Amino acid sequence: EKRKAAAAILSLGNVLNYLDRYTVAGVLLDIQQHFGVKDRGAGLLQSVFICSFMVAAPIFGYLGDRFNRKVILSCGIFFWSAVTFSSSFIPQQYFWLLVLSRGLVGIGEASYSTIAPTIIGDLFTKNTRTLMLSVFYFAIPLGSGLGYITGSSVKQAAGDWHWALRVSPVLGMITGTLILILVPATKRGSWLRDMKALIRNRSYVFSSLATSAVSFATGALGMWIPLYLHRAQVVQKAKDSLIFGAITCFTGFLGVVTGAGATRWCRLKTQRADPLVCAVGMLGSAIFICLIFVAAKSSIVGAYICIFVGETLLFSNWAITADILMYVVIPTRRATAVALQSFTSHLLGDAGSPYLIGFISDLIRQSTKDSPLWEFLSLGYALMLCPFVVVLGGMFFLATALFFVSDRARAEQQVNQ
Template structure:
């Protein structure tokens, strides 16, 4: 082992920057969830109206709709233009709209601003994984992506904490030094004024420090997608014809359906249930405990999922990623059902089961992205990633929080007691369990196709290396064969 080369230092610095921004992405996305009780309350939200579960869910649905609609657009741009500049502009956009949403004079203005945040986040989430694929070779790609996706549970949990914490601090400060009666100075608004400043700093990191690798660098090819609307639709048709890609995208959509609804409603459900059964938690404590469960369970699940997939790779090949994802959603659905069922009887046991549900659902984060990157040729990866984001959200969490909220409102009727809200959310959240099990079945179906799909990408890469005068079987650090032509070589250090 020698000293770390300058090239590796630049690569690892770029990876750290991508991780930090993904962390901020999820903090920003879930700060508003940490202040849902205040936002729903007509005397505390500054809108002078009580917000129903349906209206609150629309805030997340509006975000997801813009997020999923613009993901294919940024996927197209990411295959053809500077990914670094696309991400930098995107971070500035989402930070600006987050700041603007904290000054919304009414619910509808807040809905519009939160929806526009999704445009900026789409640019980053779509493009960043393809940069990681070009920074790291096949044997390191799963591990690098697992580190990148650790930011999801950690950022989500921090979002709950930042949201409720900022609101609490603002409430204490304003009560002493300033009247909080002004609608634009309500404490919950300060939860949305934390991340924008950090977002601008992250945009500077992207534009000034991040290194953008050549597309296909680690496969030993240098490629760029063709321009034009026709070329884009050709890329989409190419992706649709890849069975394992489509089945995994649909399976992941069922996973995001469950995760999106739980992320929106689980904390509020526990808060209402604790008050109903006579062991009331404060909103801050509920978010803190839920944050700890999300961080520890999500961190453990993401790492275990990627390492399990990596170790299984030598035995079952690329199907290992599908098996891990299938197991993830099956166990996630079972543990979610058990956590919901026990919550009204033994709340402490429900917390333990919720931990295992989060752990299980997070097993799939890295492997599902690896499936996309390994079954799609380099110059179409951003498009494929964007289209997968579109499918996973339009069929998943674009409407699952809204659906759960609407079902909860229907069951509850005009009753607004803690008992009524707890029971209605309990019954509505059972929907997430069934969606997770369906997703597990779709990933199992993908195992029958993924080996052949990955082999086609290998043939393509080898052909292009030959045109460039390079050895198709070369294993140099920056021109390694694609991931699946030799399963053992792809996973052994």
């Protein structure tokens, strides 16, 4: 009751946590025409969000261990909710204010993302704990798709795009209030040596690189596909991001389910089933992601079908990389491994993926005739680097597969002693 409600309100907070990152991505067209910026600043928004998130996350993992986790969590939520509401009133000439507010929202969300799973893990035990944490993660695809749908529908209804940013913090105030009320005051229960031991961990290194490629593809695509689809529709002379949000929710759930089923099918034949599957999914999704840019030139329904299948296949290896890190890393180094892997996946992945895609798009457009057709074509050419990164991530998962047996053998050897 007390702890099941706490888990419920923390799951709602995570829904809001992910609903506030993709509200900007679902209204990006209106932001560009309002502020007059090109693809570069549009990518810079999400890049600054992720660059602040990945730097604040370790610090809040260090502050939550020392001080009250629930106080930091509640102050974080309220803080990003306020930054989101206050930034909705930014006038036209201050785009740097909007980018800096995106960065501040990323700092606050880092507190929640870092501290809420520890609270849920400390409230529950065993299977109860495993299910509860799962419900918390269930909010990633639901939150993302709801962010897309919310931004698009609120811009459609209100006649303005700021209301996309204005409607969500009202729920964050209530979630922070109930986290003050519902969530109990739960208490707490060398890194460089662990890093020295983990750099020689070939399977951990290559799994981290594969996760970095996944993050690159996910960040760039989730930022730039709702806008690429709109440009495709305009050249093929709102709805796009609503359909994309529905697809995002359903494909996140379906991808987790299908990855679990595939690994459960492959446990009968290969000891390297966990990484190998992760590779075959990636080289699968890379076939379909590229097809997004082949179908959208002629049909948007084909683009949606390819998004569906490629997003199901890209999201299948989300829960299997955690399996690999559990398998190959001894539990004393597992916290450092998770922290460093998150930092590496952000830094080499989605911290610069949206800005890189925007910069490539702008550089293609500058050396070429300017037109809606060429806007759409330049964004497609820029986005064609996501399939290449997915191919490299599949190669890195294969390299993890070659060493999975050896590294898991040494991990079991060390934990048995």
